[PDB]
Amino acid sequence: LRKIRAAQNISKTIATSQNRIYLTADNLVLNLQDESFTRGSDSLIKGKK
Amino acid sequence: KAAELIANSLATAGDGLIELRKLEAAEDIAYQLSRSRNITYLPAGQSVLLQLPQ
């Protein structure tokens, strides 16, 4: 059984192997725009008294 | 010098000495060639906060 033990260890050491992927994340970004931007206007002839 | 020194030490140490020097080295090579360990997982686990009614 010393032989078997050694065999266990050898097989165990040799055998193991794997690879995995992980992806830690979380999307947190804040885009804040307040009073600032433009709309649009048409053309109209105006005049004030 | 190292090799010769080993040889001489081995000679004084007798055959038994070389024998296991051989296994030491073999162990080292086999091990270096194959180093590894592995754990596989299924993602799980949670922080649970539960409320109990009274």
b/e map A1-40, b = 16+ CB within 10 Å = eeeeeeeeeeeebeeeeeeeeeeeeeeeeeeeeeeeeeee
Which residues contact residue A15 at a Cβ distance below 8 angstroms, ignoring those fewer than 6 apart? B36
Q: Is A7 on the interface with B (CB under 8 A)?
A: no
Euclidean distance between CA atoms B4 and B13, whole angstroms: 14
At residue B27, the 3 state secondary structure works out as helix
Helix (H) or strand (E) holding B14: helix B2-33
The residue among B23, B22, B25, B32 whose CA lies nearest residue A14 is B32
Contacts of B35 in chain A (CB under 8 A): 13
What is the C-alpha to C-alpha distance for residues B34 and B46, in angstroms, rounded to an integer? 36
Kindly tell me the sign of the dihedral angle through the C-alpha atoms of A35, A38, A41, A46: positive
Resolution reading in Å? 16.3
B40 to chain A, minimum CA–CA distance in Å? 8
Contacts of B35 (CB under 8 A, 6+ apart): A13
Classify B13 as helix, strand or coil.
helix
State the method.
Answer: cryo-EM
Token pair in block for residue B9 = 């030490």
DSSP assignment letter at B22: H
Q: In degrees to the nearest 10, what's the CA dihedral of B17, B20, B24, B25?
A: 80
Q: Do residues B51 and A29 make contact, with C-beta atoms less than 8 angstroms apart?
A: no
For residue B42, which amino acid is it? L
